[PDB]
Design a protein around this ligand. Structure first.
Ligand SMILES: COc1ccc2c(CCN)c[nH]c2c1
Ligand SMILES: [Ca+2]
Length: 223
């Protein structure tokens, strides 16, 4: 997260870290057994880390649970990033508590102008690299689809939305991939792609979760 702030330990209790020997992506806990992340975060050997603040220190509220199954969206296209969503099932159910909590799926699609919370352990610099230990947060509004398409002509599908700032300086970045965009207490977006981080006229692009609620619900009812 570039241009954000330190969330505060466990104040984003649905935020997970995906670990393959090191943190490589975020995700969102949607119930005791399932995490939503980006399809571009798919890899083998995923351990889901819940209850994290400092990802380099065991602080006492973590749960580390291996993935037992990953399900990338059937229509995910890695070249265009259309349908950039994946489900991860936990080998055992997480114990839900004040530091480990699920986030509800949306009932409707959030509207332009709505303020949302984006979080992760990604790079905090728009030029160069610096990776934080504690979870970072950014408040960012959803942008109109006309402004989103103007920023990324020919690239925004109906499964994507832009959030952030056209002036740059505040954005999600490398390593925030797969993490949550939460608006009105619901998971509306997944950190998906952009042109760099926090660049002028290049706001972050996010998977439009509301389009996937039926797929999520049917998949978790059968796996
Ligand atoms: C390889 O560099 C990057 C830089 C930024 C991003 C993002 C978020 C952009 N708002 C998702 N994946 C990335 C990969
Ligand atoms: Ca920790």
């Amino acid at each position: 997260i570039v241009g954000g702030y330190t969330c505060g330990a466990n104040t984003v209790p649905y935020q997970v870290s995906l670990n393959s020997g090191y943190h490589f992506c975020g995700g969102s806990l949607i119930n005791s057994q399932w995490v939503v992340s980006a399809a571009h975060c798919y890899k083998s050997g995923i351990q889901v880390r819940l209850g994290e603040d400092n990802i380099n220190v065991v602080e006492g509220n973590e749960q580390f649970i291996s993935a037992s199954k990953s399900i990338v969206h059937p229509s995910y296209n890695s070249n265009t990033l259309n349908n950039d969503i994946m489900l991860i099932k936990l080998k055992s159910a997480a114990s839900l508590n004040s530091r480990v909590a699920s986030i509800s799926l949306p009932t409707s699609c959030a509207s332009a102008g709505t303020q949302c919370l984006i979080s992760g352990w990604g790079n905090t610099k728009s030029s160069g690299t610096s990776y934080p230990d504690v979870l970072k947060c950014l408040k960012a509004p959803i942008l109109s689809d006309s402004s989103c398409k103007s920023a990324y002509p020919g690239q925004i599908t109906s499964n994507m939305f832009c959030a952030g700032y056209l002036e740059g300086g505040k954005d999600s970045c490398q390593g925030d991939s797969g993490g949550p965009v939460v608006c009105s207490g619901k998971l509306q977006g997944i950190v998906s792609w952009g042109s760099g981080c926090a660049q002028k006229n290049k706001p972050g692009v996010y998977t439009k979760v509301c389009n996937y609620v039926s797929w999520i619900k049917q998949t978790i009812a059968s796996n």
